[PDB]
Design a protein around this ligand. Structure first.
Ligand code: GNP
Ligand code: CA
Ligand code: CA
Ligand code: MG
Ligand code: MG
Ligand code: MG
Ligand code: NA
Length: 166
């Protein structure tokens, strides 16, 4: 069956792991354990196609991010995650998009911009600001909450749909 290799990137603490774990394992991780490099694999049906998702959950903390570039190299599509209550994480997206361009040696890489923690109280990134960033890159913007599961399937399956357009 078809395999889609997805990679989740973004700053430390934005919820990359919680998003991935909510998708794959259907629960919310409340604690914060920084990731080095973890992978998940699950068979799903997306738009009628039975396929395998192979998801690489990467480090956002610089301390844990050593060989991240090498892990990312085989990714077919990337979630670029920030948190809507973390302006710096949004400002950092540019760096992740550049890193993706370097590891894929392409300026045409399937990507989705994800504004996570949309359940949070202290929003500092307004939807329109993120829509504009995504528009600049030619990619969709989706908001998610790993806590409530809002948007989580939509985000990952949208990334698959973006891969399928390349
Ligand atoms: N309220 C809320 N908290 C969230 C959400 N997603 C993650 N968190 C919380 O934010 C913290 C960090 O989440 P985590 O998934 O570990 O972040 P990460 O991006 O994987 N961090 P790292 O890059 O160090 O591996 C955790 O306490 C987690 O519960 C969300 O959608 N809403
Ligand atoms: Ca929990
Ligand atoms: Ca993590
Ligand atoms: Mg390169
Ligand atoms: Mg503002
Ligand atoms: Mg398109
Ligand atoms: Na930055």
């Amino acid at each position: 069956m078809t395999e889609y290799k997805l990679v989740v990137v973004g700053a430390g603490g934005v919820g990359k792991s919680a998003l991935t774990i909510q998708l794959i394992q259907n629960h919310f991780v409340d604690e914060y354990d920084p990731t080095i490099e973890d992978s998940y694999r699950k068979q799903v049906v997306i738009d009628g196609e039975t396929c395998l998702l192979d998801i690489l959950d990467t480090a956002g903390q610089e301390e844990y991010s050593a060989m991240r570039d090498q892990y990312m190299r085989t990714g077919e599509g990337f979630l670029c995650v920030f948190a809507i209550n973390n302006t710096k994480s949004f400002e950092d997206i540019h760096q992740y998009r550049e890193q993706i361009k370097r590891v894929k040696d392409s300026d045409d890489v399937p990507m989705v911009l994800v504004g996570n923690k949309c359940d949070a109280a202290a929003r500092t990134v307004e939807s329109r600001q993120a829509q504009d960033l995504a528009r600049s890159y030619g990619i969709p913007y989706i908001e998610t909450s790993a806590k409530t599961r809002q948007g989580v399937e939509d985000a990952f399956y949208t990334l698959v749909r973006e891969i399928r357009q390349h």
